[PDB]
Design a protein around this ligand. Structure first.
Ligand SMILES: NC(=O)c1ccc[n+]([C@@H]2O[C@H](COP(=O)([O-])OP(=O)(O)OC[C@H]3O[C@@H](n4cnc5c(N)ncnc54)[C@H](OP(=O)(O)O)[C@@H]3O)[C@@H](O)[C@H]2O)c1
Ligand SMILES: COc1ccc(C(=O)c2c(-c3ccc(O)cc3)sc3cc(O)ccc23)cc1
Ligand SMILES: COc1ccc(C(=O)c2c(-c3ccc(O)cc3)sc3cc(O)ccc23)cc1
Length: 340
């Protein structure tokens, strides 16, 4: 009848200062073509703070719902949606407003899943982003050298594994020896703990002819290093630049004044990627991702915060903790919050 949900009440990249937990909200009713989903797990994404900052559409004032992805049970649906879905059915989705106990989701974008497991949620945004970007833009093939930053993170774990399946030689950056071990377990050829080992030097010495593809999620100095490390005809894919998201503009400083010159000299490229521009590829990506997940051919690491200071991310209120956890760089795999 009523429920809790998170609401952006003030525009800001500081999640805590931007978002409020609202405690007596009416449970929304699904339309003819909608599902009403009781969320059991929701995804925490780096860009959640870009969203709370209002950067997706600056013409939109608070309050508005937040959260990009969820998985749970269909508890109610409109008549038309009932042709495909049924009450009690497990579904996952990528749609705004997942940070709530119940979310209305158009049946046409929902993804039927085998059951309500957090592993399936990792595929929705993090998995598809890696799958689609690398397939469409990566030009992957046997022997290509691929550099993945934030490699032990939500989407990084997939860029890593998929590149390995494409028979590429893969290098991955992360911030701890434990993260490096995780990378090794995913078949990383060259894990690099950037806190203990200078990435630029590793690249210059061990990969003198450069890397062919960069899956770049960090920005700033890491972006600078990756540009310098590009091989002839190399491709740097701008997936993100999380090092800048908390700043007032959300940007990270780069030493890019000489970027065009470097790109010309190497016939190399810098290519942006935004998941929402590739939705025509989404259903197929998710279909394949789900196969590998269920068959065990893809590790879908979940960080539910069980080893965080305050423990398992349970309840909407723990979303604040979980966001902070990401930005402290503590997570291995996808950050997920449970709503018991
Ligand atoms: N374009 C798209 O459609 C799309 C879709 C999904 C995600 N993304 C991007 O992919 C990247 C990762 O997002 P995610 O949600 O999956 O997060 P995530 O990788 O699971 O976690 C972020 C990781 O980045 C590193 N990091 C955190 N704060 C940092 C900081 N201030 N400076 C440098 N590094 C920091 C940490 O790993 P370390 O141990 O390596 O430092 C941290 O664990 C982000 O740029 C996100 O925006 C883009
Ligand atoms: O069209 C848009 C509008 C806004 C954005 C934006 O907010 C994002 C970014 C951005 C940051 C600072 C800006 O000034 C503009 C966009 S980075 C990033 C990474 C993601 O995984 C998802 C979204 C974004 C992206 C595409
Ligand atoms: C350019 O098109 C592709 C598509 C898939 C691949 C690839 O090798 C694989 C996958 C792939 C899918 C999407 C990507 O962006 C990269 C790799 S997944 C997978 C699973 C297996 O058991 C065996 C191989 C693969 C390589 C190039």
């Amino acid at each position: 009848s009523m429920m809790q949900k998170l609401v952006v009440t003030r525009l800001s990249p500081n999640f805590r200062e931007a978002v409020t937990l609202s405690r007596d909200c009416p449970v929304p009713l699904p339309g003819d073509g909608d599902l009403l989903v009781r969320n059991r797990f929701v995804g925490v994404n780096a860009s959640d703070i870009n969203y709370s900052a209002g950067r997706y559409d600056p013409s939109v004032k608070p309050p508005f719902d937040i959260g990009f992805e969820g998985i749970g049970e269909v508890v109610a649906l409109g008549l038309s949606a009932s042709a495909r879905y049924t009450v009690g059915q497990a579904v996952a989705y990528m749609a705004p407003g997942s940070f709530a106990e119940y979310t209305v989701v158009p049946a046409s974008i929902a993804t039927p899943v085998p059951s309500v497991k957090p592993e399936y949620l990792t595929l929705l945004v993090s998995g598809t982003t890696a799958y689609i970007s690398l397939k469409e833009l990566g030009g992957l093939s046997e022997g290509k050298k691929v550099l993945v930053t934030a490699a032990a993170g939500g989407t990084g774990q997939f860029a890593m594994q998929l590149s390995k399946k494409a028979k590429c030689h893969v290098i991955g950056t992360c911030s701890s020896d434990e993260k490096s071990a995780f990378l090794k377990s995913l078949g990383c050829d060259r894990p690099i703990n950037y806190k203990t080992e200078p990435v630029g030097t590793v690249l210059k010495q061990e990969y003198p002819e450069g890397v062919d593809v960069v899956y770049e999620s960090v920005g700033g100095a890491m972006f600078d290093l990756a540009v310098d490390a590009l091989a002839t005809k190399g491709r740097l894919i701008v997936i993100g630049f999380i090092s800048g998201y908390q700043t007032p503009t959300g940007l990270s400083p780069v030493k890019a004044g000489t970027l065009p010159a470097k790109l010309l000299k190497k016939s190399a490229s810098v290519q942006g990627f935004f998941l929402n521009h590739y939705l025509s590829k989404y259903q197929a990506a998710m279909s394949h991702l789900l196969e590998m997940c269920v068959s065990g051919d893809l590790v879908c690491e979940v960080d539910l915060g069980d080893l965080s200071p305050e423990g398992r991310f349970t309840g909407l209120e723990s979303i604040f903790r979980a966001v902070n956890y990401m930005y402290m760089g503590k997570n291995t795999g996808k950050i997920v919050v449970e709503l018991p």
